[PDB]
Design an enzyme around this catalytic site. Sequence first.
Site, mmCIF file in Angstrom:
data_model
loop_
_atom_site.group_PDB
_atom_site.id
_atom_site.type_symbol
_atom_site.label_atom_id
_atom_site.label_comp_id
_atom_site.label_asym_id
_atom_site.label_seq_id
_atom_site.Cartn_x
_atom_site.Cartn_y
_atom_site.Cartn_z
ATOM 1 N N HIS A 124 2.927 -2.028 10.536
ATOM 2 C CA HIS A 124 3.981 -2.257 9.532
ATOM 3 C C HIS A 124 4.635 -1.001 8.945
ATOM 4 O O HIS A 124 4.223 -0.477 7.875
ATOM 5 C CB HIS A 124 3.316 -2.983 8.362
ATOM 6 C CG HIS A 124 3.141 -4.424 8.553
ATOM 7 N ND1 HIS A 124 1.899 -5.022 8.781
ATOM 8 C CD2 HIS A 124 4.039 -5.423 8.494
ATOM 9 C CE1 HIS A 124 2.068 -6.338 8.817
ATOM 10 N NE2 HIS A 124 3.349 -6.602 8.614
ATOM 11 N N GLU A 146 7.422 -0.654 7.553
ATOM 12 C CA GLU A 146 8.117 -1.004 6.328
ATOM 13 C C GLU A 146 7.183 -1.058 5.136
ATOM 14 O O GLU A 146 7.661 -1.128 4.002
ATOM 15 C CB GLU A 146 8.838 -2.314 6.453
ATOM 16 C CG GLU A 146 8.040 -3.623 6.339
ATOM 17 C CD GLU A 146 7.049 -3.937 7.501
ATOM 18 O OE1 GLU A 146 6.883 -3.163 8.473
ATOM 19 O OE2 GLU A 146 6.584 -5.097 7.541
ATOM 20 N N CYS A 156 4.832 -6.923 13.541
ATOM 21 C CA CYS A 156 3.632 -7.759 13.283
ATOM 22 C C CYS A 156 3.888 -9.201 13.693
ATOM 23 O O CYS A 156 3.980 -9.493 14.873
ATOM 24 C CB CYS A 156 3.141 -7.555 11.902
ATOM 25 S SG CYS A 156 1.433 -8.233 11.686
ATOM 26 N N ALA A 177 -12.640 3.510 -4.216
ATOM 27 C CA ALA A 177 -11.687 3.653 -5.336
ATOM 28 C C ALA A 177 -12.170 2.788 -6.511
ATOM 29 O O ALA A 177 -12.633 1.656 -6.359
ATOM 30 C CB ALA A 177 -10.329 3.196 -4.939
ATOM 31 N N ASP A 178 -12.036 3.350 -7.697
ATOM 32 C CA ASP A 178 -12.536 2.684 -8.925
ATOM 33 C C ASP A 178 -11.615 1.664 -9.520
ATOM 34 O O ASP A 178 -12.075 0.792 -10.279
ATOM 35 C CB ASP A 178 -12.876 3.783 -9.942
ATOM 36 C CG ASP A 178 -14.208 4.514 -9.601
ATOM 37 O OD1 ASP A 178 -15.226 3.813 -9.309
ATOM 38 O OD2 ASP A 178 -14.222 5.784 -9.630
#
Length: 1290
Positions: free
Chosen positions: A1255, A1257, A1130, A673-674
Amino acid sequence: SGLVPRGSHMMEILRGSPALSAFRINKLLARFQAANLQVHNIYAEYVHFADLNAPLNDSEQAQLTRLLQYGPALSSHTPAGKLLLVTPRPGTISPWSSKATDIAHNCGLQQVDRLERGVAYYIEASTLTAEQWRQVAAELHDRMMETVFSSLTDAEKLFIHHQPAPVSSVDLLGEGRQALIDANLRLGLALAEDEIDYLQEAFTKLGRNPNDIELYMFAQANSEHCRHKIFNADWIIDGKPQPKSLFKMIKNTFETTPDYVLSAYKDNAAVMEGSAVGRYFADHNTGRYDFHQEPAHILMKVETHNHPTAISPWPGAATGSGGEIRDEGATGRGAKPKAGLVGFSVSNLRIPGFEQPWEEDFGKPERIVTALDIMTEGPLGGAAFNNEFGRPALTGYFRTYEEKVNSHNGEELRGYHKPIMLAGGIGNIRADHVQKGEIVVGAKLIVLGGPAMNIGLGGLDFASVQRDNPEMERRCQEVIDRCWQLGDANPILFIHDVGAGGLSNAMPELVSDGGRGGKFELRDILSDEPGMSPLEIWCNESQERYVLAVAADQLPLFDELCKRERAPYAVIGDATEEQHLSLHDNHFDNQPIDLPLDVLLGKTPKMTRDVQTLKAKGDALNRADITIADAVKRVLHLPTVAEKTFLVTIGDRTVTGMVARDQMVGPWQVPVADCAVTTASLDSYYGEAMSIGERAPVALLDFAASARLAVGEALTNIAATQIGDIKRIKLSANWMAAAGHPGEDAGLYDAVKAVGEELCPQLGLTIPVGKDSMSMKTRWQEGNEQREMTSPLSLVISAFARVEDVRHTLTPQLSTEDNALLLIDLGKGHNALGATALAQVYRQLGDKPADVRDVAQLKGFYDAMQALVAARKLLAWHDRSDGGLLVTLAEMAFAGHCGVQVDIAALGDDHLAALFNEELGGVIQVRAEDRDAVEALLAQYGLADCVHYLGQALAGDRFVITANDQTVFSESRTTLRVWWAETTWQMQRLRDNPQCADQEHEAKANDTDPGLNVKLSFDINEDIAAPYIATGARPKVAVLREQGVASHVEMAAAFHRAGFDAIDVHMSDLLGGRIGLGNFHALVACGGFSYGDVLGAGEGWAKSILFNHRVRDEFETFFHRPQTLALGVCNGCQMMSNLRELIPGSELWPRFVRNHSDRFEARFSLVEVTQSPSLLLQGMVGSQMPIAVSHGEGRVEVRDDAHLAALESKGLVALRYVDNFGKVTETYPANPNGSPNGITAVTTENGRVTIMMPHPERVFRTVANSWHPENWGEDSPWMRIFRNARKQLG
Ligand SMILES: Nc1ncnc2c1ncn2[C@@H]1O[C@H](COP(=O)(O)OP(=O)(O)O)[C@@H](O)[C@H]1O
Ligand SMILES: [Mg+2]
Ligand SMILES: [Mg+2]
Ligand SMILES: [Mg+2]
């Protein structure tokens, strides 16, 4: 356990568990064998040392013993052979110690003064000589931080009590100027002659001798690092006086473009306008989380930590993050860090067994570490800080460069032996807190944060070894948050971070910024080192501290806030009307400082730099050994180009629940991703974006071109994000140079002028923040000769912008729907090869580099992209940077897991230059049916002659480049993608469990991997909680947190969306009686890093509950009620696994321990929901979908196979990792942690309690899922967990 006298205290020795897994033991044996040290075996155990102020009774002793039983259940061995004990060096206190000791105190063991840990190594090597034993000892420790002892009892030396050292005066009156000259040398003040003059006159006028502390304070305040003399200097260049300083040229950008800026050059961050959104936090009076619709303005900062990283890279990088996070939180009257960025530049890696053909060993100073060791330990330190503090790290760069080149000063070595270690980020701030407040006379002056030590005094070189404790900083951030969350009642009048110079800078700058003086008491400052002198106390660069001013009548409120978060604080002074600085010492009954502020803060003259231009003559690239095919292979092997996973997955990318676009893209999670994108809130699609541009090697040919390309690339990296007006984009400009090196000074001025006076004003880009680091060169003796390694001028530009709709962001993931690939060549056919990756990999610099060719067209590119983005006309985008068009296309094919067929005949006859130039621009992919309309749009912006139809993305594995009827280059895309992976493979392999590194690498070579994919057993859009929410009856959920926990806001928001009233419940609230669990029907324990995971993840939290009979009882009672629900995620999962004696139906639960990789894993992992009693997963059984994972100790550990079989037969397993083929897996990283049978969630027999490592959430919002199916709405599958909880309660 052992227990001996230790001064007025007694030290106990407690043996711990085995310390090294089998791979690490084998690595050590192989290293000893390679060094010709005949070692038969080695075994390591942790050993703990407890310094006690009073005795433990039998119950207390068993509790301490139990506290110190943790970690993976590796098999114990009887000690045999020679003991070498490795501990922190005497005079230092590990961060491990700080955290472990807090746990002991929160478990009611106040008799523990301090806990510390070492590693006992037992080495069987009967044949070694005394010298060879020294090499063994050298191998087993870090000489900058640790010591080796031959007895366990030697650890007493770590706890020696030292009496305070007195202040020392410097005898100017008795000796004249020579006293100042001698002190200059002895104390390392680095004062110039005119500074000695100023001090001599100041103290002559006062008629008394300066104290050492006063000279040291002055010297730190007048360093280059602190004063910015170069950036404020007058200049003469080639004989002409220049009209502006560097700083003034940067400010020209704000003078030209003030738009959207709320704060520039008057705080240690800039602020710009954000969006009005629901800022989500727990109310001070009710403890309930609620949305507050208001502007969430955006702060930004970028810093570096270059010198210390060369000496001790883990703390260098870690405290580089830490100091930058403090600048953010201390913006205005208090603010909240949101997301981070990271940059590294180092010399050649020279990875053993993977040396590349451009790399030559040129030597290095003995006193510094290697490039490889920086890229091994540094990223882990910076990542440990961001992870533990709790901000996601979402964009970055990593460049290698070390070559003998014919540059501006002729042939010399240019590189990064002193690295670039860069840390930055964004945060949010309230409008009414942007402006720092005034400091009333009589304001109380406070140090918020850690008890200090003699660290980093004035920035072997022990003073360059920093110390990081992110959990301390998180506790402080919670207090800052409580303050700004009070709105109009925020008690912070002024806040600043404590950085260089320590208190000696921070406190005088705080009172001076309010137009006040201060009076301080030395003995009110919190210390962890009672031996310190006044100079050390005042000047040390201990970490995790802030200074602030509060009205006296707000102290009781401030004290409440701090005590609830367990954040240490001290009132250490009072603001005065008189502009004087006084520091008193109640112990010595004297006054170490007594100075007018104008004397202290008074300045010698401005610098003048009178310098000359040097400019390299390029040489044409010698293409003798270059072929297109060989160039592609080499370039893919340059670290700067190559896959970056080793730097990405070590850092959390999901904490806050606001991350929309992280580095990893698409179903194959390829890090291309840039730019980074976050949502502005948990309830908006407005957001923020971050990108970086940098192009240092260009500065070896053309200084201004390198700076223009850094700005240009920041724009091209950000361009496929929905922003609108270019004036929304704000820059940080971070300038690294070897000031004084021939040609660099004039080049620096020309580069600053190029961007500040020219390019940025013409584009409408403000630079409202920045920094400089001006000694980027290393010198040493290499055999007989002087050697030097000098950086290119290295501008790093970070771009920050408010985002109009995060959903409309494009990535490099190609579609194979009918499509067109169009190059936008902002190089205008120049096709420059100088200072490219191509040149570098053949050990050359070349002739002429790229550059911004046409300012109007750069702006036109940006505006055209913004029009295309908003009109939804792009399928993908990837910009051109290191490795040229070749690498751009390759990376797109990797992300789309497909092929390309492209023709380059229109890009010139020189195919090498067409494919490998690093001119600005990139490749857009559009639907085939949109091609003509897109081309017409680009033509409207003046770009037609830059635009070239290349061809198409196609299903399959062929990467084909043609020119008319000739094949220029053709290869398997998988082959290319595996070559591009080899650097991360090799880094992972040497740093982590090599089995895992290998599994991860080899999986990339299987083209049949279908990538992440979903199977849904329910309707994800059906809000099964709606009929309950529609009644307005909202059950409470206790959102439980502990010191160090950062995951709680977004946990609350998930339950809020499902209809709950989310209550903030800190463990201090339970311990103080402010909350009782009898009032709740649901509880959730949240993730993050309570106590920095010291004493085993979740263990200190759990044992703090178990060892307080009242709180233990409360928990037990809650779990034994007939209808209560609990979730542990977690860190909460870990905690609850350690509390299972209180939880009915949990007898078969596993432990959660160090991942098999031996590395933190921040992954977007595929799971399947399995059949179990779990109420929270009702309706979802058989579903398969990805989820955020962010943990280092998530591996399910059972006692034996009997235990695993029993747990499985009971049917309590609720989630399992699967591979992309859908099968249950233990292969890495599909299974990120090595859990047997992929287990990653368990439930109890009644289904009422569920614990899980991932996770949900963080990913309940579709927009926060790194990859997801295009047809999803607002809700992801994971929303159903919270809805199930609501419906269950009725
Ligand atoms: N030091 C780093 N820490 C974290 N992410 C990084 C680091 N270096 C690079 N990355 C990420 O890896 C990806 C590839 O990086 P790079 O090729 O340098 O980007 P670009 O060429 O687009 O400027 C990007 O998503 C970038 O944010
Ligand atoms: Mg790149
Ligand atoms: Mg890019
Ligand atoms: Mg880049």
